[PDB]
Design a binder for these strands. Structure first.
Lengths: 335, 228, 228, 335, 48
DNA sequence: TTAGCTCGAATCGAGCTAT
DNA sequence: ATAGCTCGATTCGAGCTAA
């Protein structure tokens, strides 16, 4: 009857590293190899009562008493130097290949059927649309999450590191290439073919991606935020902790991977939001909602079950979504 | 001696013994299906009751952790202020109209989740009564978290009959419901021998697989699913 | 011609004929089991779907009367005065602790009956929702008044399997629920060919009886009983 | 009647060490003795539910509430430095003699018959094919389990350490020697002869195995993982822990032994699925399938019983499998 | 150490925003200037 | 209450039909 | 959707043992 496998673990393609933040001045970014790193430091914040009150704390005496005892805490803060207006963020990306092959599979017949399904996809249309959209999210600085919202000029440089050396160099204007449209461009097409060769398994590709953002002198930059155990004293609370590896502000690799993953424009709801990350049940953390609900028969699992088990191939857009979710990887199958 | 079966659990002894102090001993290991839970070296002079009492505490903490892990999510009926809880209902699933909500004064009654980011909608007492009637959770709804989703589905084309081990979650005296097999057969209007044929071990020639309607009516009458 | 069977109803023609006017004519007799409701003389040129339409209004009146005379008892939730009805729920059985009551001010919520000698019980919203969940009535609970009390009982020793005619009340194209045999079989997770053996009549070769669990689960899924 | 003995404890031949894993740059890998160790650090991860729902969680409001309350974890993560692109993994291997001799037994007659059977095996065909296959799982960096999947270039260096100094050095291109075929090669033949002399008990063999791989600049490396006690909160849950010896990320020695143990190509299914580690009952946990089922007459226990008790010698491939199980050791015998 | 625009006098940010958006009761142009300034400064508005 | 086992009888699924 | 069939396999009840 060819039921689905209980264990369907997949390994991820498109492996990014931690993205390190350094700082410097515009028009000296061609010699940015020795730019000083952005350092996460401590500052003190004093806050008032600015949250909603539950109809019992709205008493004027209680509210004023809460004012007389403000919350004192220290926060991890990352800022550019006062003589530097450009933020440099550098990471390396490795594209593996072999997306349809699971890392663990209970059923051999289901494994073979899934391999035939993915091979039929690649033979019909290869990793060309998906790689083009991944190259688009590389060209624009979407991995530069909050450091791009107010940057005046953003430039992304992507190199192909073959034997430890730049075999091919790309330079992009990350603001001309927006965060909404997946258009066509010759350099975008070349990077798309490179990522396609990586995803197909034709050759080994390693991409060094460097983004420069002209934000301003001494302006705040935004690395990834860590978890606080919340055990110390209230005055030295450490309400905000920033991610660094060796005294250098950094962005988590999975955040970079999530920003590169933002290629899903095929979800049933409208195009007002634009692309979203290719996740099962189309989850967006900021909106707190799930596009591609399982009730709407457009999530990853129902589409994969219809495509593989019972040969109901969906539309080519949903096929792109399914293959991008297999590239994304995850612990599929019933636990 | 021989293996002790307590519902889904099994206390099997080691084949070869040992001597601790001057007295003979065997290692008794506790299982939950294929999951080994604990091993104890016990004297050969213990009876089955003492061996069972040695693992009763581990079984009890497993039961407590299973009740707290798979407890049904709770909906709360609040006033316009959103502070005073007027009624609490535990539901097997949430209403499909739940969205991010803070109560206003435009509506007197609001139904909200007990989860910290609260989801809700304005509700009347008639609508709240209807939702609580058609969404409530049975008192032993936590046992469904210990069972796979392909035995608890109402879709007959996606349904699989439960195995003997999955039956013993709810049918035995050492099970999570605490009813006997004869009581379970009386609930289904079935002979006790025919129902024992359902929970027969693998070392048996006469084994029967329970049907869709019988299994789901058993779950209804046991207070596990579809009982509100 | 042929005897038209519409659920529990059966329009059988007269074996002899007559000539009212000049056209051929036959006497068609509506039956509700062993009960005769109407005799209507009709031509032979009418099709079966037109005699069905001719007898449809009497069947509709019978269904209206059956739904009205077997409506479940309605409970009313009122304030500390008894004038405003905040919520009403139809129940299959009354609460165990009802006594003759007039609401007063010492309790804010009162659960009174809809009958004019209003029995009542002081409740809070949580206990009111518990009672509503426990005691609610399914939407098609009025069909239980047309069924014997020994086929609806939950006691397995005093339970009697329904006959084919008593089964046509809840399954069939012209049944009181309106669900087909295939849909009923899909609800019970069984084949339609086996359910047709349940609904088979006058064919002594290969006719089966429904079981306790299957019958009560079917009544659960159709919305007739056990849907509190 | 010569019944089987009730204890058959065997000690493990081919005893490896924990493989310590460190980082550096390519073409300085000859002077890699002072490379800094790869350290195990912690990062915070946030994600939404991507697993299959139980059909009870398919309700849209539950999914939206789970997205609005995402699960927070801290995980141990191992990365290369942002200036290093090569990972060096080093372990020592000991090849011991006396494979057929059990460490514990109940029956002198059974152990004499077993020793005679192993001796007539070694006389008929010594440890030549088995050591040939072992040399391969060392010449290909199969002990670099997930550190080899997308590595651009992998090489391994095996040094024969005699009186604490290198007696003979081997250098192999680990990507040239595949993970599937046992071909013939002169340096591989010499290493196989050395391993055969170690297994035969005719000499002391200690090997220093060093592997270098182009994972990438700052990319993630994969040491071995530990158990999680789950005795903390659900936000700082510590869902993943990695293995370290003295602050250097490391791989468990049993994982290395399994990697070198992958020589079984004689199971009744097709060998096109690849070699398997020699085990009783041919178990693969990732695939959840048992090759060499006891229902078939090709598992280790029935082969050992037929060969020894009643002199039913199997095929030379199946007796290679039996002697490989005797080399790997194990608590055999009934109870 | 005191709070002008108490929630009791219905001139705080939250009541004005709720009335303007939900009930469509637009406040005075000064009060909506204050509300938009509160949107400019940012915040973690919105309790459970 | 657990844990089974025959033995004939009724039921079950999946093939076909007919109307 | 109604109405009914055959045929081999599975279930079912009421005896029974076994503890």
């Amino acid at each position: 009857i060819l039921s689905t496998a209980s264990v369907l673990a997949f390994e991820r393609k498109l492996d990014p590293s931690d993205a390190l933040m350094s700082a410097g001045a515009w028009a000296q970014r061609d010699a940015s190899q020795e730019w000083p790193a952005v350092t996460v430091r401590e500052k003190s914040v004093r806050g008032t009562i600015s949250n909603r009150l539950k109809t019992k704390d709205r008493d004027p005496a209680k509210l004023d008493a809460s004012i007389q005892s403000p919350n004192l805490q220290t926060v991890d803060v990352a800022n550019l130097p006062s003589d530097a207006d450009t933020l440099k963020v550098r990471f390396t990306l490795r594209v593996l290949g072999g997306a349809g092959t699971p890392s663990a599979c209970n059923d051999a017949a289901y494994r073979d059927k899934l391999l035939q399904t993915v091979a039929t996809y690649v033979n019909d249309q290869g990793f060309a649309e998906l790689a083009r959209r991944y190259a688009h999210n590389l060209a624009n600085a979407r991995f530069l999450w909050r450091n791009r919202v107010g940057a005046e000029a953003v430039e992304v440089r992507i190199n192909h590191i073959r034997q430890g050396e730049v075999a091919r160099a790309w330079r992009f204007d990350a603001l001309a290439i927006g965060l909404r449209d997946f258009k066509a461009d010759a350099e975008l097409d070349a990077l798309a073919e490179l990522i396609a060769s990586g995803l197909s398994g034709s050759g080994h590709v390693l991409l060094e991606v460097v983004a420069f953002a002209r934000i301003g002198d001494g302006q705040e930059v935004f690395p990834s935020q860590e978890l606080i155990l919340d055990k110390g004293d209230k005055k030295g609370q450490k309400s905000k902790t920033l991610y660094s590896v060796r005294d250098a502000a950094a962005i988590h690799s999975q955040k970079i991977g999530n920003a590169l993953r933002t290629i899903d424009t095929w979800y049933p709801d409208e195009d007002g939001l634009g692309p979203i990350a290719v996740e099962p049940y189309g989850s967006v953390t900021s909106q707190g909602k799930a596009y591609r609900q399982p009730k709407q028969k457009l999530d990853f699992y129902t589409l994969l079950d219809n495509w593989v088990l019972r040969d109901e191939a969906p539309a080519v857009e949903q096929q792109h979504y399914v293959i991008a979710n297999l590239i994304r990887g995850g612990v599929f199958g019933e636990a | 001696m021989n293996a002790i079966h307590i519902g889904p659990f099994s206390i099997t002894p080691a084949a070869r013994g040992l001597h601790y102090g001057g007295l003979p001993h065997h290692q008794w290991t506790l299982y939950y299906g294929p999951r080994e839970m604990a091993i104890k070296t016990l004297p050969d002079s213990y009876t089955s009751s003492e061996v069972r009492d040695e693992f009763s505490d581990i079984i009890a903490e497993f039961v407590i952790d299973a009740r707290h892990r798979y407890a049904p999510d709770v909906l709360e009926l609040v006033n316009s202020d959103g502070d005073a809880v007027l009624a609490r209902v535990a539901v097997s699933r949430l209403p499909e109209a739940l969205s991010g909500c803070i109560p206003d004064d435009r509506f007197p009654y609001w139904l909200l989740t007990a989860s910290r980011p609260r989801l809700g909608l304005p509700v009347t007492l008639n609508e709240y009564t209807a939702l609580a009637v058609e969404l409530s959770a049975p008192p032993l709804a936590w046992i469904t978290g210990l069972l796979p989703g392909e035995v608890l589905t109402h879709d007959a084309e996606e349904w699989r009959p439960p195995t003997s081990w999955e039956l013993r979650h709810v049918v035995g005296e050492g099970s999570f419901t605490g009813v006997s097999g004869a009581a379970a057969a009386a609930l289904l209007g079935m002979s006790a021998t025919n129902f024992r044929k359902y929970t027969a071990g693998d070392s048996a020639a006469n084994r029967q697989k329970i049907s869709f309607a019988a299994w789901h009516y058993l779950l209804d009458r046991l207070g596990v699913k579809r009982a509100s």
